[PDB]
Curated annotation (Swiss-Prot), chains A, B:
Role: Catalyzes the attachment of pyrrolysine to tRNA(Pyl). Pyrrolysine is a lysine derivative encoded by the termination codon UAG.
Parent sequence residues shown: 188 to 454 of 454
Species whose genome carries this gene: Methanosarcina mazei (strain ATCC BAA-159 / DSM 3647 / Goe1 / Go1 / JCM 11833 / OCM 88)
Protein name, per record: Pyrrolysine--tRNA ligase
Lineage start: Archaea, Methanobacteriati, Methanobacteriota, Stenosarchaea group, Methanomicrobia
Main subcellular location of this protein, as a coarse class: cytoplasm
GO MF: ATP binding; pyrrolysyl-tRNA synthetase activity; tRNA binding
Length: 255, 255
Protein backbone atom coordinates (compact mmCIF):
# COMPACT_ATOMS: atom_id res chain seq x y z
CA UNK A 1 0.00 0.00 0.00
CA UNK A 2 2.28 2.74 1.30
CA UNK A 3 5.41 3.33 -0.78
CA UNK A 4 8.67 2.33 0.84
CA UNK A 5 11.36 4.97 1.39
CA UNK A 6 13.52 3.30 -1.30
CA UNK A 7 10.64 3.38 -3.77
CA UNK A 8 10.00 7.02 -2.95
CA UNK A 9 13.69 7.78 -3.52
CA UNK A 10 13.46 6.06 -6.92
CA UNK A 11 10.39 8.06 -7.91
CA UNK A 12 11.99 11.32 -6.75
CA UNK A 13 14.92 10.61 -9.05
CA UNK A 14 12.42 10.48 -11.90
CA UNK A 15 10.46 13.47 -10.70
CA UNK A 16 11.02 16.87 -12.24
CA UNK A 17 10.23 20.21 -10.53
CA UNK A 18 7.47 20.58 -13.14
CA UNK A 19 5.56 17.38 -12.26
CA UNK A 20 2.26 17.62 -10.39
CA UNK A 21 0.96 1.94 -6.71
CA UNK A 22 4.76 2.04 -7.31
CA UNK A 23 5.27 0.21 -10.58
CA UNK A 24 2.52 2.33 -12.11
CA UNK A 25 3.85 5.64 -10.75
CA UNK A 26 7.32 4.66 -12.04
CA UNK A 27 6.05 3.67 -15.47
CA UNK A 28 4.28 7.02 -15.75
CA UNK A 29 7.38 9.03 -14.82
CA UNK A 30 9.67 6.90 -17.01
CA UNK A 31 7.39 7.64 -19.97
CA UNK A 32 7.46 11.36 -19.19
CA UNK A 33 11.23 11.51 -18.76
CA UNK A 34 11.86 9.70 -22.03
CA UNK A 35 9.52 12.19 -23.71
CA UNK A 36 11.43 15.12 -22.16
CA UNK A 37 14.75 13.71 -23.47
CA UNK A 38 13.19 13.10 -26.87
CA UNK A 39 12.05 16.74 -27.06
CA UNK A 40 15.53 17.97 -26.12
CA UNK A 41 17.10 15.68 -28.71
CA UNK A 42 14.66 16.87 -31.38
CA UNK A 43 14.92 20.58 -30.71
CA UNK A 44 17.63 22.32 -28.66
CA UNK A 45 20.26 19.59 -28.02
CA UNK A 46 22.29 21.90 -25.78
CA UNK A 47 23.50 20.86 -22.35
CA UNK A 48 22.38 23.16 -19.48
CA UNK A 49 25.86 23.69 -18.10
CA UNK A 50 27.43 24.24 -21.50
CA UNK A 51 24.68 26.65 -22.53
CA UNK A 52 24.90 28.63 -19.27
CA UNK A 53 28.68 28.94 -19.75
CA UNK A 54 28.05 30.34 -23.24
CA UNK A 55 25.38 32.76 -22.01
CA UNK A 56 27.64 34.00 -19.20
CA UNK A 57 30.55 34.36 -21.65
CA UNK A 58 28.53 36.52 -23.98
CA UNK A 59 27.32 38.68 -21.08
CA UNK A 60 30.87 39.55 -19.93
CA UNK A 61 32.51 39.71 -23.32
CA UNK A 62 29.79 42.20 -24.34
CA UNK A 63 30.52 44.27 -21.19
CA UNK A 64 34.23 44.61 -22.00
CA UNK A 65 35.75 41.65 -20.14
CA UNK A 66 38.50 39.55 -21.77
CA UNK A 67 37.74 35.79 -21.86
CA UNK A 68 40.47 33.75 -20.17
CA UNK A 69 41.08 29.96 -20.32
CA UNK A 70 43.82 28.99 -17.87
CA UNK A 71 45.12 25.62 -16.57
CA UNK A 72 42.91 23.47 -14.40
CA UNK A 73 45.94 21.52 -13.17
CA UNK A 74 48.05 24.08 -11.22
CA UNK A 75 51.19 24.18 -9.06
CA UNK A 76 50.57 23.35 -5.42
CA UNK A 77 52.62 26.50 -4.69
CA UNK A 78 49.70 28.63 -5.93
CA UNK A 79 47.55 27.32 -3.08
CA UNK A 80 50.12 28.36 -0.50
CA UNK A 81 50.56 31.71 -2.24
CA UNK A 82 46.80 32.30 -1.93
CA UNK A 83 47.26 32.29 1.83
CA UNK A 84 45.73 28.85 2.20
CA UNK A 85 47.68 27.22 5.01
CA UNK A 86 46.90 24.23 7.27
CA UNK A 87 44.83 26.69 9.33
CA UNK A 88 41.93 27.06 6.87
CA UNK A 89 39.18 24.71 5.70
CA UNK A 90 40.31 24.75 2.05
CA UNK A 91 43.74 23.34 2.97
CA UNK A 92 42.08 20.00 3.54
CA UNK A 93 39.82 20.18 0.50
CA UNK A 94 42.65 20.12 -2.06
CA UNK A 95 42.90 17.36 -4.66
CA UNK A 96 46.62 16.81 -5.11
CA UNK A 97 48.14 15.43 -8.30
CA UNK A 98 51.74 14.16 -8.24
CA UNK A 99 53.97 15.89 -5.71
CA UNK A 100 53.87 19.44 -7.04
CA UNK A 101 50.42 19.96 -8.58
CA UNK A 102 46.73 19.98 -7.76
CA UNK A 103 43.30 20.53 -9.29
CA UNK A 104 42.49 24.26 -8.89
CA UNK A 105 39.99 24.79 -6.05
CA UNK A 106 39.39 28.32 -7.38
CA UNK A 107 40.24 30.63 -10.28
CA UNK A 108 41.95 33.51 -8.42
CA UNK A 109 45.60 32.49 -8.78
CA UNK A 110 45.63 32.28 -12.61
CA UNK A 111 43.52 35.45 -12.81
CA UNK A 112 45.97 37.31 -10.48
CA UNK A 113 48.72 36.27 -12.92
CA UNK A 114 46.75 37.63 -15.87
CA UNK A 115 45.91 40.94 -14.14
CA UNK A 116 49.63 41.45 -13.51
CA UNK A 117 50.75 40.51 -17.02
CA UNK A 118 47.98 42.27 -18.94
CA UNK A 119 48.59 45.54 -17.08
CA UNK A 120 51.77 45.85 -19.16
CA UNK A 121 49.79 45.85 -22.37
CA UNK A 122 46.20 46.90 -21.88
CA UNK A 123 44.63 50.27 -21.14
CA UNK A 124 43.07 50.92 -17.77
CA UNK A 125 40.84 49.42 -16.44
CA UNK A 126 41.79 45.74 -16.92
CA UNK A 127 38.63 43.58 -17.12
CA UNK A 128 38.85 39.80 -17.36
CA UNK A 129 36.89 36.68 -16.48
CA UNK A 130 37.17 32.94 -16.62
CA UNK A 131 34.64 30.14 -16.44
CA UNK A 132 35.80 26.61 -15.78
CA UNK A 133 36.02 23.49 -13.60
CA UNK A 134 37.24 23.83 -9.99
CA UNK A 135 37.66 21.02 -7.45
CA UNK A 136 37.22 20.63 -3.69
CA UNK A 137 36.82 17.57 -1.44
CA UNK A 138 33.47 18.16 0.25
CA UNK A 139 31.31 16.45 2.90
CA UNK A 140 28.03 18.00 1.75
CA UNK A 141 26.22 16.68 -1.30
CA UNK A 142 23.03 18.74 -1.47
CA UNK A 143 24.67 22.15 -2.08
CA UNK A 144 28.28 21.12 -2.77
CA UNK A 145 29.92 19.18 -5.59
CA UNK A 146 33.50 17.99 -5.50
CA UNK A 147 33.67 18.82 -9.19
CA UNK A 148 32.05 22.17 -9.98
CA UNK A 149 32.23 25.10 -12.40
CA UNK A 150 33.08 28.64 -11.34
CA UNK A 151 32.71 31.98 -13.06
CA UNK A 152 35.16 34.59 -11.65
CA UNK A 153 35.17 38.06 -13.21
CA UNK A 154 37.32 40.97 -12.10
CA UNK A 155 38.32 44.50 -12.90
CA UNK A 156 41.53 46.26 -11.86
CA UNK A 157 42.42 49.97 -11.92
CA UNK A 158 39.77 52.66 -12.44
CA UNK A 159 36.16 52.24 -11.35
CA UNK A 160 36.80 49.51 -8.81
CA UNK A 161 34.17 50.56 -6.32
CA UNK A 162 31.67 48.58 -4.28
CA UNK A 163 28.95 50.40 -6.22
CA UNK A 164 30.30 49.24 -9.59
CA UNK A 165 30.70 45.69 -8.29
CA UNK A 166 27.15 45.52 -6.91
CA UNK A 167 25.88 46.96 -10.20
CA UNK A 168 27.54 44.27 -12.33
CA UNK A 169 26.29 41.55 -9.96
CA UNK A 170 22.79 42.98 -10.16
CA UNK A 171 22.65 43.28 -13.93
CA UNK A 172 24.20 39.80 -14.22
CA UNK A 173 21.66 38.03 -12.00
CA UNK A 174 18.69 40.02 -13.32
CA UNK A 175 19.89 39.03 -16.80
CA UNK A 176 19.85 35.31 -15.85
CA UNK A 177 16.59 35.70 -13.96
CA UNK A 178 17.84 34.62 -10.56
CA UNK A 179 16.58 36.21 -7.35
CA UNK A 180 19.25 37.33 -4.88
CA UNK A 181 20.30 39.53 -1.98
CA UNK A 182 23.75 41.08 -1.46
CA UNK A 183 24.95 40.97 2.16
CA UNK A 184 28.11 41.87 4.02
CA UNK A 185 30.52 39.23 5.33
CA UNK A 186 39.20 44.33 2.15
CA UNK A 187 35.44 44.60 1.68
CA UNK A 188 33.75 41.18 1.31
CA UNK A 189 30.16 40.55 0.19
CA UNK A 190 28.05 37.45 -0.29
CA UNK A 191 25.33 37.16 -2.93
CA UNK A 192 22.64 34.97 -1.42
CA UNK A 193 19.56 33.21 -2.72
CA UNK A 194 17.64 32.46 0.46
CA UNK A 195 20.19 30.58 2.56
CA UNK A 196 22.22 29.50 -0.49
CA UNK A 197 25.44 31.33 -1.32
CA UNK A 198 25.55 32.12 -5.04
CA UNK A 199 28.76 34.11 -4.85
CA UNK A 200 31.51 35.62 -2.74
CA UNK A 201 32.66 39.00 -3.97
CA UNK A 202 35.38 41.38 -2.85
CA UNK A 203 36.44 44.97 -3.22
CA UNK A 204 40.21 45.17 -3.11
CA UNK A 205 42.89 46.05 -2.61
CA UNK A 206 43.79 43.43 -0.02
CA UNK A 207 47.10 42.38 1.63
CA UNK A 208 47.23 39.22 -0.49
CA UNK A 209 47.69 41.32 -3.69
CA UNK A 210 51.33 42.01 -2.87
CA UNK A 211 52.19 38.34 -3.18
CA UNK A 212 50.94 38.39 -6.78
CA UNK A 213 52.64 41.60 -7.88
CA UNK A 214 49.37 43.56 -7.84
CA UNK A 215 49.25 47.09 -6.40
CA UNK A 216 46.05 48.55 -7.86
CA UNK A 217 42.50 48.59 -6.61
CA UNK A 218 40.23 45.89 -8.03
CA UNK A 219 36.82 44.26 -7.65
CA UNK A 220 35.80 40.70 -8.42
CA UNK A 221 33.29 37.94 -7.69
CA UNK A 222 33.11 34.17 -8.06
CA UNK A 223 29.85 32.34 -8.86
CA UNK A 224 29.16 28.60 -8.94
CA UNK A 225 27.36 27.71 -12.19
CA UNK A 226 25.72 24.57 -10.77
CA UNK A 227 24.24 26.64 -7.95
CA UNK A 228 22.85 29.13 -10.47
CA UNK A 229 21.28 26.30 -12.49
CA UNK A 230 19.93 24.68 -9.32
CA UNK A 231 18.12 27.87 -8.37
CA UNK A 232 16.96 28.69 -11.86
CA UNK A 233 15.56 25.23 -12.53
CA UNK A 234 14.29 24.64 -9.01
CA UNK A 235 16.42 21.49 -8.59
CA UNK A 236 16.34 20.24 -4.99
CA UNK A 237 19.71 18.50 -5.16
CA UNK A 238 22.70 20.17 -6.86
CA UNK A 239 23.75 16.84 -8.39
CA UNK A 240 21.02 17.46 -11.00
CA UNK A 241 23.08 20.39 -12.36
CA UNK A 242 26.50 18.71 -12.23
CA UNK A 243 28.71 17.15 -14.89
CA UNK A 244 27.42 13.63 -14.60
CA UNK A 245 26.44 10.36 -16.17
CA UNK A 246 23.28 10.26 -14.00
CA UNK A 247 21.35 13.34 -15.17
CA UNK A 248 21.04 15.18 -18.48
CA UNK A 249 19.65 18.71 -18.13
CA UNK A 250 18.04 17.66 -14.87
CA UNK A 251 16.50 14.49 -16.33
CA UNK A 252 17.56 11.12 -14.95
CA UNK A 253 19.48 9.01 -17.43
CA UNK A 254 18.60 5.81 -15.47
CA UNK A 255 15.44 5.05 -17.40
CA UNK B 1 76.83 41.24 -33.30
CA UNK B 2 75.26 37.83 -33.80
CA UNK B 3 72.27 37.10 -31.56
CA UNK B 4 72.82 34.48 -28.90
CA UNK B 5 70.62 31.36 -28.89
CA UNK B 6 68.92 32.59 -25.69
CA UNK B 7 68.19 35.96 -27.29
CA UNK B 8 66.82 34.23 -30.36
CA UNK B 9 64.59 32.08 -28.14
CA UNK B 10 63.30 35.25 -26.46
CA UNK B 11 62.54 36.91 -29.79
CA UNK B 12 60.81 33.77 -31.09
CA UNK B 13 58.52 33.87 -28.07
CA UNK B 14 57.50 37.36 -29.18
CA UNK B 15 57.29 36.44 -32.83
CA UNK B 16 53.94 35.69 -34.42
CA UNK B 17 53.45 33.58 -37.59
CA UNK B 18 52.39 36.85 -39.26
CA UNK B 19 55.64 38.77 -38.62
CA UNK B 20 58.05 39.38 -41.51
CA UNK B 21 70.56 44.37 -32.58
CA UNK B 22 68.66 42.45 -29.83
CA UNK B 23 67.26 45.14 -27.56
CA UNK B 24 65.91 46.92 -30.64
CA UNK B 25 64.40 43.79 -32.21
CA UNK B 26 62.78 43.00 -28.83
CA UNK B 27 61.42 46.50 -28.37
CA UNK B 28 59.87 46.32 -31.83
CA UNK B 29 58.17 42.98 -31.18
CA UNK B 30 57.05 43.99 -27.68
CA UNK B 31 55.35 47.04 -29.19
CA UNK B 32 53.65 44.89 -31.81
CA UNK B 33 52.47 42.27 -29.33
CA UNK B 34 51.00 44.87 -26.99
CA UNK B 35 49.18 46.35 -30.00
CA UNK B 36 47.81 42.90 -30.94
CA UNK B 37 46.51 42.39 -27.37
CA UNK B 38 45.04 45.89 -27.37
CA UNK B 39 43.14 45.15 -30.61
CA UNK B 40 41.78 41.90 -29.16
CA UNK B 41 40.73 43.68 -25.98
CA UNK B 42 39.03 46.45 -27.97
CA UNK B 43 37.18 44.25 -30.43
CA UNK B 44 36.59 40.50 -30.10
CA UNK B 45 37.70 39.65 -26.52
CA UNK B 46 37.15 35.93 -27.09
CA UNK B 47 39.76 33.33 -26.23
CA UNK B 48 40.83 31.08 -29.16
CA UNK B 49 40.20 27.82 -27.33
CA UNK B 50 36.88 28.95 -25.89
CA UNK B 51 35.72 30.27 -29.27
CA UNK B 52 36.76 27.09 -31.11
CA UNK B 53 34.84 25.01 -28.54
CA UNK B 54 31.75 27.15 -29.23
CA UNK B 55 32.16 26.88 -33.01
CA UNK B 56 32.57 23.09 -32.81
CA UNK B 57 29.54 22.85 -30.50
CA UNK B 58 27.34 24.72 -32.92
CA UNK B 59 28.54 22.56 -35.82
CA UNK B 60 27.52 19.29 -34.13
CA UNK B 61 24.41 20.52 -32.39
CA UNK B 62 23.21 21.78 -35.80
CA UNK B 63 23.93 18.33 -37.31
CA UNK B 64 21.77 16.50 -34.74
CA UNK B 65 24.31 15.60 -32.04
CA UNK B 66 23.39 15.94 -28.35
CA UNK B 67 25.87 18.07 -26.32
CA UNK B 68 27.28 16.16 -23.36
CA UNK B 69 29.22 17.51 -20.33
CA UNK B 70 30.53 14.63 -18.23
CA UNK B 71 32.99 14.41 -15.29
CA UNK B 72 36.63 15.18 -15.85
CA UNK B 73 37.55 13.37 -12.62
CA UNK B 74 36.62 9.69 -13.26
CA UNK B 75 36.93 6.30 -11.53
CA UNK B 76 40.23 4.56 -12.15
CA UNK B 77 38.10 1.50 -12.97
CA UNK B 78 37.02 3.18 -16.23
CA UNK B 79 40.62 3.11 -17.45
CA UNK B 80 40.88 -0.63 -16.85
CA UNK B 81 37.47 -1.14 -18.45
CA UNK B 82 38.73 0.65 -21.58
CA UNK B 83 41.23 -2.17 -22.01
CA UNK B 84 44.12 -0.02 -20.84
CA UNK B 85 46.37 -2.40 -18.92
CA UNK B 86 50.05 -2.18 -17.92
CA UNK B 87 50.80 -3.38 -21.46
CA UNK B 88 49.92 -0.14 -23.27
CA UNK B 89 51.51 3.31 -23.39
CA UNK B 90 48.49 5.08 -21.88
CA UNK B 91 48.71 3.00 -18.68
CA UNK B 92 51.74 5.04 -17.72
CA UNK B 93 50.31 8.37 -18.83
CA UNK B 94 47.48 8.43 -16.26
CA UNK B 95 47.21 11.22 -13.70
CA UNK B 96 45.84 9.52 -10.59
CA UNK B 97 43.85 11.36 -7.93
CA UNK B 98 43.32 9.70 -4.53
CA UNK B 99 43.25 5.91 -4.64
CA UNK B 100 40.21 5.35 -6.84
CA UNK B 101 40.08 8.25 -9.33
CA UNK B 102 42.02 9.90 -12.12
CA UNK B 103 41.88 12.75 -14.62
CA UNK B 104 40.22 11.37 -17.79
CA UNK B 105 42.84 10.73 -20.49
CA UNK B 106 40.00 10.48 -23.04
CA UNK B 107 36.25 10.94 -23.41
CA UNK B 108 35.20 7.43 -24.52
CA UNK B 109 34.21 5.92 -21.17
CA UNK B 110 31.60 8.58 -20.23
CA UNK B 111 30.34 8.63 -23.83
CA UNK B 112 29.97 4.79 -23.82
CA UNK B 113 27.85 5.22 -20.68
CA UNK B 114 25.67 7.82 -22.40
CA UNK B 115 25.22 5.75 -25.58
CA UNK B 116 23.98 2.87 -23.42
CA UNK B 117 21.64 4.96 -21.28
CA UNK B 118 20.25 7.18 -24.04
CA UNK B 119 19.38 4.15 -26.20
CA UNK B 120 16.54 3.52 -23.73
CA UNK B 121 15.00 6.88 -24.49
CA UNK B 122 16.04 8.25 -27.83
CA UNK B 123 15.13 7.26 -31.38
CA UNK B 124 17.70 5.64 -33.61
CA UNK B 125 20.38 6.72 -34.44
CA UNK B 126 21.89 8.05 -31.18
CA UNK B 127 24.22 11.00 -31.92
CA UNK B 128 26.23 12.64 -29.16
CA UNK B 129 29.46 14.56 -28.62
CA UNK B 130 31.50 16.09 -25.86
CA UNK B 131 34.25 18.68 -25.80
CA UNK B 132 36.41 19.04 -22.73
CA UNK B 133 39.75 18.77 -20.90
CA UNK B 134 41.64 15.46 -21.00
CA UNK B 135 44.98 14.69 -19.31
CA UNK B 136 48.03 12.58 -20.12
CA UNK B 137 51.62 12.60 -18.80
CA UNK B 138 53.71 13.22 -21.91
CA UNK B 139 57.41 13.45 -22.82
CA UNK B 140 56.88 15.54 -25.96
CA UNK B 141 56.18 19.25 -25.73
CA UNK B 142 56.00 20.40 -29.35
CA UNK B 143 52.92 18.37 -30.37
CA UNK B 144 51.71 17.11 -26.98
CA UNK B 145 50.26 18.87 -23.93
CA UNK B 146 49.72 17.16 -20.61
CA UNK B 147 46.54 19.20 -20.30
CA UNK B 148 44.57 19.27 -23.55
CA UNK B 149 41.04 19.55 -24.92
CA UNK B 150 39.34 16.81 -26.93
CA UNK B 151 36.25 16.77 -29.10
CA UNK B 152 34.78 13.22 -29.41
CA UNK B 153 31.59 12.79 -31.43
CA UNK B 154 29.83 9.51 -32.11
CA UNK B 155 26.77 7.94 -33.62
CA UNK B 156 25.26 4.56 -32.74
CA UNK B 157 22.66 2.48 -34.61
CA UNK B 158 21.66 3.28 -38.20
CA UNK B 159 24.02 4.88 -40.69
CA UNK B 160 27.22 3.95 -38.90
CA UNK B 161 29.33 3.40 -41.98
CA UNK B 162 32.90 4.36 -42.83
CA UNK B 163 31.43 6.53 -45.60
CA UNK B 164 29.24 8.49 -43.17
CA UNK B 165 32.15 8.90 -40.75
CA UNK B 166 34.54 10.16 -43.43
CA UNK B 167 31.82 12.53 -44.64
CA UNK B 168 31.31 14.13 -41.22
CA UNK B 169 35.09 14.44 -40.74
CA UNK B 170 35.38 16.06 -44.15
CA UNK B 171 32.58 18.57 -43.69
CA UNK B 172 33.89 19.32 -40.17
CA UNK B 173 37.46 20.10 -41.23
CA UNK B 174 36.44 21.92 -44.41
CA UNK B 175 34.12 23.98 -42.19
CA UNK B 176 37.04 24.96 -39.89
CA UNK B 177 39.35 25.46 -42.85
CA UNK B 178 41.95 22.87 -41.92
CA UNK B 179 43.74 20.78 -44.54
CA UNK B 180 43.82 17.04 -43.91
CA UNK B 181 44.17 13.50 -45.23
CA UNK B 182 42.33 10.42 -43.94
CA UNK B 183 44.51 7.30 -43.75
CA UNK B 184 44.13 3.76 -42.49
CA UNK B 185 45.75 2.55 -39.27
CA UNK B 186 37.21 -2.68 -35.92
CA UNK B 187 38.11 -0.23 -38.68
CA UNK B 188 40.53 2.50 -37.48
CA UNK B 189 41.44 5.68 -39.38
CA UNK B 190 43.75 8.60 -38.67
CA UNK B 191 43.05 12.14 -39.88
CA UNK B 192 46.44 13.67 -40.61
CA UNK B 193 47.71 17.15 -41.33
CA UNK B 194 51.13 16.47 -42.83
CA UNK B 195 52.80 14.33 -40.18
CA UNK B 196 50.54 15.63 -37.40
CA UNK B 197 47.66 13.47 -36.19
CA UNK B 198 44.51 15.59 -35.89
CA UNK B 199 42.25 12.68 -34.99
CA UNK B 200 41.83 8.96 -34.50
CA UNK B 201 38.50 7.65 -35.71
CA UNK B 202 36.85 4.25 -35.62
CA UNK B 203 34.04 2.33 -37.22
CA UNK B 204 32.60 -0.09 -34.71
CA UNK B 205 31.44 -2.42 -33.51
CA UNK B 206 34.52 -3.59 -31.62
CA UNK B 207 35.09 -6.25 -28.90
CA UNK B 208 35.43 -3.54 -26.24
CA UNK B 209 31.73 -2.56 -26.69
CA UNK B 210 30.55 -5.59 -24.74
CA UNK B 211 32.22 -4.32 -21.58
CA UNK B 212 30.10 -1.17 -21.78
CA UNK B 213 26.76 -2.81 -22.53
CA UNK B 214 26.82 -1.71 -26.17
CA UNK B 215 25.77 -4.12 -28.93
CA UNK B 216 25.04 -1.84 -31.90
CA UNK B 217 27.23 -0.57 -34.69
CA UNK B 218 28.68 2.91 -34.19
CA UNK B 219 31.20 5.40 -35.58
CA UNK B 220 33.16 8.06 -33.74
CA UNK B 221 36.26 10.24 -33.80
CA UNK B 222 38.34 12.21 -31.30
CA UNK B 223 40.08 15.49 -32.22
CA UNK B 224 42.52 17.56 -30.16
CA UNK B 225 41.42 21.21 -30.18
CA UNK B 226 44.91 22.59 -29.50
CA UNK B 227 46.22 20.69 -32.52
CA UNK B 228 43.45 22.15 -34.68
CA UNK B 229 44.30 25.67 -33.47
CA UNK B 230 48.02 25.03 -33.97
CA UNK B 231 47.45 24.11 -37.60
CA UNK B 232 44.91 26.82 -38.27
CA UNK B 233 47.04 29.59 -36.80
CA UNK B 234 50.36 28.22 -38.00
CA UNK B 235 51.75 28.01 -34.45
CA UNK B 236 55.09 26.16 -34.39
CA UNK B 237 54.76 24.99 -30.79
CA UNK B 238 51.45 23.64 -29.46
CA UNK B 239 51.97 25.47 -26.16
CA UNK B 240 50.76 28.59 -27.98
CA UNK B 241 47.28 27.03 -28.23
CA UNK B 242 47.11 25.61 -24.70
CA UNK B 243 45.34 26.74 -21.53
CA UNK B 244 48.14 28.82 -20.13
CA UNK B 245 49.35 31.87 -18.30
CA UNK B 246 52.12 32.34 -20.91
CA UNK B 247 50.16 32.98 -24.12
CA UNK B 248 46.83 34.62 -24.92
CA UNK B 249 45.47 33.71 -28.36
CA UNK B 250 49.00 32.92 -29.44
CA UNK B 251 50.45 36.18 -28.10
CA UNK B 252 53.05 36.05 -25.35
CA UNK B 253 51.85 37.48 -22.06
CA UNK B 254 55.48 38.05 -20.92
CA UNK B 255 55.75 41.58 -22.25
N1 LIG C 1 31.85 22.60 -3.63
C1 LIG C 1 31.15 23.46 -4.37
N2 LIG C 1 30.16 23.03 -5.16
C2 LIG C 1 29.46 23.87 -5.91
N3 LIG C 1 29.72 25.17 -5.91
C3 LIG C 1 30.70 25.67 -5.14
C4 LIG C 1 31.45 24.82 -4.34
N4 LIG C 1 32.33 25.57 -3.68
C5 LIG C 1 32.15 26.83 -4.05
N5 LIG C 1 31.17 26.90 -4.95
C6 LIG C 1 30.69 28.12 -5.65
O1 LIG C 1 31.81 28.99 -5.86
C7 LIG C 1 31.52 30.26 -5.25
C8 LIG C 1 32.80 30.98 -4.82
O2 LIG C 1 33.66 30.14 -4.05
P1 LIG C 1 33.79 30.29 -2.45
O3 LIG C 1 33.37 31.67 -2.10
O4 LIG C 1 35.13 29.83 -2.02
O5 LIG C 1 32.68 29.28 -1.85
P2 LIG C 1 32.62 28.79 -0.30
O6 LIG C 1 33.17 30.00 0.36
O7 LIG C 1 33.36 27.52 -0.47
N6 LIG C 1 31.00 28.73 -0.28
P3 LIG C 1 30.42 27.59 0.73
O8 LIG C 1 31.24 26.36 0.80
O9 LIG C 1 28.92 27.29 0.24
O10 LIG C 1 30.26 28.31 2.17
C9 LIG C 1 30.61 29.89 -4.08
O11 LIG C 1 29.87 31.05 -3.69
C10 LIG C 1 29.69 28.91 -4.80
O12 LIG C 1 28.77 29.59 -5.65
N1 LIG D 1 48.88 14.92 -25.28
C1 LIG D 1 48.10 15.47 -26.20
N2 LIG D 1 48.17 16.79 -26.45
C2 LIG D 1 47.39 17.35 -27.36
N3 LIG D 1 46.52 16.64 -28.05
C3 LIG D 1 46.40 15.32 -27.85
C4 LIG D 1 47.20 14.69 -26.91
N4 LIG D 1 46.89 13.39 -26.93
C5 LIG D 1 45.94 13.22 -27.84
N5 LIG D 1 45.62 14.38 -28.40
C6 LIG D 1 44.58 14.62 -29.42
O1 LIG D 1 43.48 13.72 -29.17
C7 LIG D 1 43.27 12.94 -30.35
C8 LIG D 1 42.66 11.57 -30.02
O2 LIG D 1 43.39 10.89 -29.00
P1 LIG D 1 44.39 9.67 -29.34
O3 LIG D 1 43.96 9.09 -30.63
O4 LIG D 1 44.47 8.77 -28.16
O5 LIG D 1 45.83 10.36 -29.56
P2 LIG D 1 47.24 9.56 -29.58
O6 LIG D 1 46.78 8.27 -30.15
O7 LIG D 1 47.61 9.77 -28.17
N6 LIG D 1 47.90 10.55 -30.69
P3 LIG D 1 49.51 10.69 -30.54
O8 LIG D 1 49.99 10.68 -29.14
O9 LIG D 1 49.90 12.06 -31.30
O10 LIG D 1 50.16 9.51 -31.43
C9 LIG D 1 44.65 12.85 -30.99
O11 LIG D 1 44.50 12.53 -32.38
C10 LIG D 1 45.07 14.31 -30.83
O12 LIG D 1 44.40 15.15 -31.77
C1 LIG E 1 41.81 37.63 -9.30
C2 LIG E 1 41.01 38.28 -8.17
C3 LIG E 1 41.96 38.91 -7.15
C4 LIG E 1 42.05 37.81 -6.09
N1 LIG E 1 40.85 37.25 -6.02
C5 LIG E 1 40.24 37.23 -7.36
C6 LIG E 1 38.76 37.58 -7.24
O1 LIG E 1 38.11 37.97 -8.21
N2 LIG E 1 38.25 37.43 -6.02
C7 LIG E 1 36.85 37.70 -5.70
C8 LIG E 1 36.23 36.46 -5.05
C9 LIG E 1 36.19 35.29 -6.03
C10 LIG E 1 35.65 34.00 -5.42
C11 LIG E 1 36.62 33.34 -4.44
N3 LIG E 1 37.94 33.18 -5.08
C12 LIG E 1 36.09 31.96 -4.04
O2 LIG E 1 36.68 30.98 -4.54
O3 LIG E 1 35.12 31.92 -3.26
C1 LIG F 1 32.15 6.35 -27.23
C2 LIG F 1 32.86 5.79 -28.46
C3 LIG F 1 32.86 4.26 -28.42
C4 LIG F 1 34.23 3.96 -27.82
N1 LIG F 1 35.07 4.87 -28.32
C5 LIG F 1 34.35 6.15 -28.46
C6 LIG F 1 34.77 6.81 -29.77
O1 LIG F 1 34.09 7.69 -30.30
N2 LIG F 1 35.92 6.35 -30.27
C7 LIG F 1 36.50 6.86 -31.52
C8 LIG F 1 37.94 7.33 -31.26
C9 LIG F 1 37.96 8.51 -30.29
C10 LIG F 1 39.37 8.98 -29.92
C11 LIG F 1 40.09 8.01 -28.99
N3 LIG F 1 39.25 7.72 -27.81
C12 LIG F 1 41.40 8.65 -28.51
O2 LIG F 1 41.42 9.06 -27.33
O3 LIG F 1 42.34 8.72 -29.33
MG1 LIG G 1 33.42 25.88 1.15
MG1 LIG H 1 32.24 32.02 -0.05
MG1 LIG I 1 49.72 9.34 -27.34
MG1 LIG J 1 45.62 8.24 -32.09
Amino acid sequence: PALTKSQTDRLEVLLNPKDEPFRELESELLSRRKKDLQQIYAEERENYLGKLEREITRFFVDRGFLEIKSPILIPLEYIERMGIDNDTELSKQIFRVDKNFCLRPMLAPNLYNYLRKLDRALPDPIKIFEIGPCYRKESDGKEHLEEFTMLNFCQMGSGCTRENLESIITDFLNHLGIDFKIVGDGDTLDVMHGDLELSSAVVGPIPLDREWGIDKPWIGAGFGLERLLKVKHDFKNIKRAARSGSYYNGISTNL
